[PDB]
Design a protein around this ligand. Structure first.
Ligand SMILES: *N1CCC[C@H]1C(c1ccccc1)c1ccccc1
Ligand SMILES: *N1CCC[C@H]1C(c1ccccc1)c1ccccc1
Ligand SMILES: [Ca+2]
Ligand SMILES: [Ca+2]
Ligand SMILES: [Cl-]
Ligand SMILES: [Cl-]
Ligand code: NA
Ligand code: NA
Lengths: 221, 5, 221, 5
């Protein structure tokens, strides 16, 4: 590995510097090297891995949507460049899914965290695809839902975030707005019903995500 | 409109 | 070249798509390929080359300043990563200067345009260096000034932009605030004195840059 | 505070 000679702690340190510098490609490479040391990631380290790669693919997805939009309005130049960006985007998704399967997927919260990630990056592959991909995303999301409902409180931010992204999967990908609405409403309603389970160290993230669930419900209705 | 980060 | 098999017109077309997608690395690679076809760049194409590479190094410079600031406040991790970003930044500057010397530097406006670019990217190398670099920047800026004063009107945006960046060179690099102020004031005062030379196809850029000259004068005094 | 673009 390109990061094989660097100590794990230095890779984490440099991932944090790259974040401060908004160098998310470097940040993703440092975290990949840390994962490849073979040790589990702490909560803080999981977030760094998520922040790093989600920013990389985010920029690629935004670029792909622009080029795809230009392509629909319509020489081979637009298609060719859209394909170039598409292939690069698929490469990053394959890298993340490879890390998840090879190192990270094996604590309920951590298991849900990584299964949510797998559903996200299969969802990103489905946006440009197929169905062999969507069923992989659903299977990952669904398994993550099963664990979170049994093991984590209804206000837990990982549980809430999983349901939000899973509901987006139902709406945008599966074209199933009914399942997207019921899930988002059930998630929000069950968080409010057991609002007392908010945690002192994560309530800001819980309330943030609860509001984002409400925002999507407002749009979808 | 997924999870921001 | 990586772009050797692609037609010049398709490279220009894809540079414009990359700009729309904010894919400035791709944009810079496409324009480099266009330059390497050996034909002169039009006014529109010059701006694409400038937009592309200035955005690439801009992000690298911003990252370098962040890491350098962290380094001054202070393990070898910060220095090492700052050096990594520094080396990458120097690579892009060497690429641009290579294009300028090998293909582009040989119309008064175009000659000033490319000599201004050379001064900029030597200035960027001087920010991280030396003096063998600063004298190269000054020599490029000064030669560009000589041409613009003889060949171009005082409101011309390339002439104005050259003087603004050259004044910044005097202030931030050479630590010569007196030359920076007199040049910025002379440039602005001579633009106002001959304000009637504004061109129908570029007056928006002229007035924009005149205001930026005034803004810097306000700060420097 | 150089030329923006
Ligand atoms: N975006 C930044 C932190 C991780 C990510 C989400 C998230 C990832 C995995 C599971 C649940 C949520 C996020 C977004 C906002 C607030 C907290 C977490
Ligand atoms: N930034 C975008 C267009 C080129 C560049 C400058 C500039 C480059 C070379 C010579 C003079 C100016 C610029 C900035 C604002 C408006 C016009 C040009
Ligand atoms: Ca209750
Ligand atoms: Ca006059
Ligand atoms: Cl292409
Ligand atoms: Cl490094
Ligand atoms: Na090793
Ligand atoms: Na060729």
């Amino acid at each position: 590995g390109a990061m094989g000679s660097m100590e794990r702690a230095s890779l984490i340190q440099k991932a944090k510097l790259a974040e401060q510098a908004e160098r998310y490609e470097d940040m993703a490479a440092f975290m990949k090297g840390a994962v490849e040391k073979g040790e589990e990631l702490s909560c803080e380290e999981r977030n760094l891995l998520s922040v790093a790669y989600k920013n990389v693919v985010g920029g690629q997805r935004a670029a792909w949507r622009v080029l795809s939009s230009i392509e629909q309005k319509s020489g081979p130049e637009v298609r060719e460049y859209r394909e170039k960006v598409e292939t690069e985007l698929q490469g990053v998704c394959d890298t993340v899914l490879g890390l998840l399967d090879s190192h990270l997927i094996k604590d309920a919260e951590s298991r849900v965290f990584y299964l949510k990630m797998k559903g996200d990056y299969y969802r990103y592959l489905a946006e440009v695809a197929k169905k062999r991909i969507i069923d992989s995303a659903r299977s990952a999301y669904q398994e993550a839902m099963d664990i979170s409902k049994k093991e984590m409180p209804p206000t837990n931010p990982i549980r809430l975030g999983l349901a939000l992204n899973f509901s987006v999967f139902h709406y945008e990908i599966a074209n199933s707005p009914e399942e997207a609405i019921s899930l988002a409403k059930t998630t929000f309603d069950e968080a409010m019903a057991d609002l007392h389970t908010l945690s002192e160290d994560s309530y800001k993230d819980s309330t943030l995500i609860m509001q984002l669930l409400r925002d999507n419900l407002t749009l979808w209705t | 409109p997924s999870l921001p980060x």
